[PDB]
Amino acid sequence: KNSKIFSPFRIIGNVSNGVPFATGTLGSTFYIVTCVGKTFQIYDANTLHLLFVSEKETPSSIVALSAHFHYVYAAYENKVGIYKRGIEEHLLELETDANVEHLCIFGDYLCASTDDNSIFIYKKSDPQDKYPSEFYTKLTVTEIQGGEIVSLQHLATYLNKLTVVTKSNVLLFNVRTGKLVFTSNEFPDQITTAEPAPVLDIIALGTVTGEVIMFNMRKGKRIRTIKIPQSRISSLSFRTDGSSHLSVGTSSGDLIFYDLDRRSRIHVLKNIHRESYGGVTQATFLNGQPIIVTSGGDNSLKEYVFDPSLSQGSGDVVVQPPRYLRSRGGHSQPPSYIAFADSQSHFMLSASKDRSLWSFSLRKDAQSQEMSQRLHKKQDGGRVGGSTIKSKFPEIVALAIENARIGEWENIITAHKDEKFARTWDMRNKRVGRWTFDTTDDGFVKSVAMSQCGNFGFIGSSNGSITIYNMQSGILRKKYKLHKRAVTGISLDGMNRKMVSCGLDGIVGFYDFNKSTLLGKLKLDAPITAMVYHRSSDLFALALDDLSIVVIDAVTQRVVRQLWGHSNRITAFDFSPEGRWIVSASLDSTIRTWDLPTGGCIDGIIVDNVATNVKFSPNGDLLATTHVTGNGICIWTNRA
Amino acid sequence: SSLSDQLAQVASNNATVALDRKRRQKLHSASLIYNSKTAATQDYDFIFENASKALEELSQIEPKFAIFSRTLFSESSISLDRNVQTKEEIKDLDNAINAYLLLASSKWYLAPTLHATEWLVRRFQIHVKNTEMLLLSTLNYYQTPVFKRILSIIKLPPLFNCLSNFVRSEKPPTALTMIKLFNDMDFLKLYTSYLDQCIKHNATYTNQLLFTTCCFINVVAFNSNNDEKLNQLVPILLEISAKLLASKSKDCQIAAHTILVVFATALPLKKTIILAAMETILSNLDAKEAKHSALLTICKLFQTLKGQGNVDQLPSKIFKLFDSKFDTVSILTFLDKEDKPVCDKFITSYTRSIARYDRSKLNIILSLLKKIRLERYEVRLIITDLIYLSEILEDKSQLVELFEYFISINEDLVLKCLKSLG
Amino acid sequence: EAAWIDSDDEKIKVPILVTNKTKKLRTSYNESKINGVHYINRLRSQFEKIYPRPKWVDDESDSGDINALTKILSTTYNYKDTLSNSKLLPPKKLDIVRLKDANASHPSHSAIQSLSFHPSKPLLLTGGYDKTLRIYHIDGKTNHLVTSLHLVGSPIQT
């Protein structure tokens, strides 16, 4: 499983995996700790810049996160890890197989709740010790005492008490002596979330049927009762800027705000996060600022701000609605295609099943930006025919880019599923282009290619017709008709003289682009599926249907190498920049690196999830892959 | 931000300091009784002397004004400055000013009020600090000459910029523009808060209610095409209706009757909101004139119901409440008058409620059906319920008579209901 | 009136001066060590200085009525009755969606002089001066051609 050429580097474009993020304050500034699968990333609240990432991937997925000043605690399976600046400092291993579920830190005690309704307490060996390390005791809540534990919370000014919140009711445990001081009355509806209020002795409890309860622990009595019919609360948070507001999140993806003093609704922010992916998984007010941070399972983190009231008087009543301030995001579903935008490793294009194309920056996370799909106005003056409701373009099956004429006109071609034309994009503008290329044979787009000079775009139809358009004007110029089945690959050499095509018929044709003549025709044994053309070396590799990669020398039109060993389809493959290796992925959950000079497999890997795509950097430093699971991109460093 | 922008914010805060002579001239020049040149020449003592007399005349008209003699119009108030006071003190002064603007809201036509407010404009610079409360109180006098003067000496807040044109302009603001000012939602919340203060203090008067009603009705009309805005309007304006209905004063309730009806036609609503509206209307219904307006409102609301159960019987609590405020004799009188509005759906619901809850009124059913022609679907529902009554309730002369009525008119429909039921 | 009482708080005895932040809690400079009950009571005051006590917690508690209307507004977010349940369509707004055109499957070469929907089956009949009778099977997504019938020299008007 361990490659001798490649090693994992990071995941790009993943901002949050749905686990509630944790907020920690260093002096004035605030930072946000977010979960990304098996690692966590720390973001600065002011600019949402990436600051730190955990050095190593945890053995099991992170479940809960709590941050306290420099130190960050991440809980995976039965182990609770302490991290400083993304460097593990110490590991708290619990003595039971039960997985930790919730995590609370107040003062020198650390509380970890396992799924077996057992609460472990750790303490600091010394009063000035930075983090708790020693094992103090173990408290367990039985089913008679209360139901499953929903969350562990600590209220201010409670000496060595932990407010355990259960589905049935709320309990108060004195960790120092491990005795149950108080059990709250039973609550009819299952509890889902808890939140300590800025007021004293009052903790906000979110139920499964749209109730929020300001339960007073000291008095053991309800104070207030909100109703949100037909909803499930997922998060709660109070505003500490001096105005008595409450933000209530819902699983449906809607965030509501109430003015407790006035008993009224300020506003509702609708569908801030997709309902499908868990909606508002976490929504927290920053301590003493008008800004509220929200996250969700759709791989997005957002921030909203409450502007000052416009009314010189009675500012309390006239409340501006919240305003989008800033955000960072990524794909909601695994990327389908990737490609390197630049000769350097700066920018990456990614297209996903979520019908969105993104530009990801390897050098910095902030630079990552989405390609807007707003269409340019038609030159003819005719009205563009489309549904009034705006819907994103279908996913991108194939893509091609060039940088010879960046900034002058469109330089990207993309094909869509079940769509009879290919759309253009402009990298410099980061916006869809003004040309659409039609196959002209009632066939769907299966291949897209561009000349090196950036002037010609080739579109391969499923009915065997290859069309050539001009990128700067989008006017059809020529059309080649050789294949009788779908063409699955097109490429043009660096000199723009010799052109090569391949189709499901298993035939490879050699065309002379300048004179428009068929130089020669080659038939292979099996249908061809994909093609990569290496312009420097004039070798191109075909992923045949018999689980073979065939290298052919365009100048001479002969098979030079044939690679065997794959146990299943070849989903994707790429050439090394120098023209010496081919890295191919297959459905047998492997990535094999093939040495073209010797024609044998020199390295092999077994990935847990099949790799849909593999792409070398033109420099040769990095190798990126996308997989059937995971919203991000795995980046690898070429140890060679 | 640029240096100029920040300095502008400093100037706006420091508007009423009177740092130098030129500033003192502009501030002292603003007036509601006098021109600029004479205004600069006057002193606080002369201005206060007129106000002290003017307040006395207002006191005779209304005793409540006499209280401010102890606070705002006292001889010590001459030496009182706002710029020199602390933050806590200015709030008490603002509260005193806001209370006074409420009392003077209804007496702007009288001459003395214009003198009395001059003391506050000159001494306390309400035209700069309490700008919002002054405009809100005098919004309904928009065509009056007094309102023109207020605009000339006042700097408009961000919410009132619709009037920016009409400052120092010969024409007074038109009726159409006032709809624009109310159209923005933010103003409605602001006006709602001011209106709420009036209800709490029972400071309302007919003219304010008339003008407040006319703007709110028009705002709905201007938003009839845009459904999504109308949805945002319901939380604000219906909330006002609940407050107006809480008021004991009848004219306040009648305004709630106007404003409720227009939404019901403007936007279809859930029955629960409609049913909730009835209980609020009927809780405080004591004045006769409000009582007449209420009954028309109740009938109009049900006509807007266009869903299953549109003619379902009222809930038991609602039925008992309705009969308490409207005996059976009253509704018969309402059914009598030839110019009645269409009320068939309510009578169908009110009809079925009797059969479920009040047996002894079953005779009244005969009178009610004769007076008003009900729709065929409504009649079918009445027949269906009465059929169940006969099976359960003991057979009565009135009960058979009600059938006998249905025998006389549309006999065939009677068989169809009987065929489907028994 | 506290529901519960914790005895460990009465015995616990904490020093103040060890940490800088707690130093504010002293009442007199001589004082250096306090039992728990006073430590909690002092912590309560400092907490208030951080987050002032708002109005809603203290003065107000929930624990035919006039306020019925204002209540029902609070619970409901959608103030417009669902049009799915009602069986009359709304007056001014039409909820209309386009589908695939019926004639894409087999185009007409002349104007569509008449249209007709079969009483029970899902069929549509078209005619024109093309002198043809085209019957289409309207599904809304494909709309293929069931049959066609050419009537020589009989221009189709209806």
Binding site: P127, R176, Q289, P308 | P158 | F47
Partner: peptide, 27 residues
């Protein structure tokens, strides 16, 4: 003119927060 609705720049401000470290006590 209609009401201008400008998005004024919002920058962070210092705010005091209660620290739980004073809470834990040893006998």
């Amino acid at each position: 003119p209609k009401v201008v609705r400008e998005a004024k720049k919002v920058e962070m401000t210092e705010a005091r927060a209660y620290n739980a470290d004073a809470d834990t006590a040893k006998a």
